[PDB]
Amino acid sequence: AHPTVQGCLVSFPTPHILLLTLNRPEKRNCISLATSAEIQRLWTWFDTQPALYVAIITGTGESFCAGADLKEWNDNEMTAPGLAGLPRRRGSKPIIAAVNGYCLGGGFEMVANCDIVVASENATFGLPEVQRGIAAVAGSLPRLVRVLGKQRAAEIALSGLSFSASQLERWGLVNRVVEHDQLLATAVEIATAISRNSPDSVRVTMEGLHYGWEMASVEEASSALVDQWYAKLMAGENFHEGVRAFVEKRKPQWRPSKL
Template sequence: MSTPLTTKPMPPWISTPHPLITHSLITFPATHILLVTINRPEHRNCLPVEGTIELGALWKWYDAEPSLRCAVFTGAGDKAFCAGMDLKQRLELIETGEVAHDYPPGQFAGMSNRTGKKPIVVACNGHAHGGGFEALLNADVIFASPNSTFALPEVLRGVSALAGALPRVFLLFGNHRAMDLILTGRRLSVEEAHAWGLVKEIVPQEQLLERAIEYAKVIAGLSPDSVIISRLAAREAWETGVSRATMRGQELWAENMLRSENAREGLAAYREKREPVWKRSHL
């Protein structure tokens, strides 16, 4: 059983209620910021199928909620961000013949293959293994505690990392580093992950969440239209390759961005030598 969640009223600036969540804790640490904490520390924050479906619905709500501009994703406790799928449940599903991959389009944690509109910053507070690593690989920015490790141990369990990690480690790390990880299941230390460019900063555990939230505030303080469009245009390379991504970014988003209220506000603020006052994004 998960640790009981504390129900807190949503702040008045949230316009729509978030989906029912039973395996994660939802809070709003600052205006425009969503904080999602996987709340199964006694299970190293591994997720059952139900938990990952919930998060898929939550990220969809996050993208649609106009008052939210950046999310921070972390795990409860100081041992694990997410140890992946609940393997005991997976075995039960296999043995009973039930569907073992009834996941949302974003796949594991609703995130490992998520496209989405808005950024997700990860505060990795410990081990990110299996599906936890697959979800983290598709985050936008990652902060990690000194005890963090990263692994795709599926080959050690007779399965494979098929929720998005395999092409992502290849694109991020190159062929030989990717093969080192996926063919052995070994743990990547936080120091290696930082050297390889996966982790932005290694932050002491007691400061980790505060650092990630402060970083999210920086993003949330910018034009939401610019953040959404810049992120989508850059991430097109995951799907289409660099040259085609550049063309699609121009085709799909440039005109809408330049016609937006926030583009006018940003340029006017520059001309008038004042801080911009951003409007809600309607993208």
């Protein structure tokens, strides 16, 4: 029993990993308002389901996602978490984008806020909003400034042109570029590594990484993580299992998080 998503597939590479496959490549994997809402409900489930540790989003064919359904938008409030629940997500658990092709407009605004990004060599990225008389207002602009630097975010967003996977790796957004055949396996390998770690440790690490984008100073972010999360982490059954496993020189057996 899992939520379903119209025009998409929901599957489980392992019992601890959720995969969303965007499955309307015939429409360049553009996302309707109804699909967007159903994807937001899947992430609500994911975040709340204690046994799920990591999620992946990917596309099909030559498209990752070309953004919102423009036929529908032509016939529209901009809020958090935004299109498919990603551009302005503040996640409790990490989501990996596996970008297999065109990643344009709202689709690129989705990826700019994913936790880890891997891309096939054929993937391309762009914000063509400026060419059509609108703008990328889903939340990517300040995020791209902080990942790519101002001048690279400016070249992408002001020009509206398409840029390669290799360019977005040199510029800081894409963690790894791999051959298309290896894309999903690479995302699953990274997800599997994360899924083997303590679920409490992964929750607290996500909080610490978020504070880096939320607070004016690195010291306020440092104090906040200790003050809000350190006692709770050390109180958990998982931390005590970690210490029993060290002292006993054996592998730790983790339980799902309540944090």
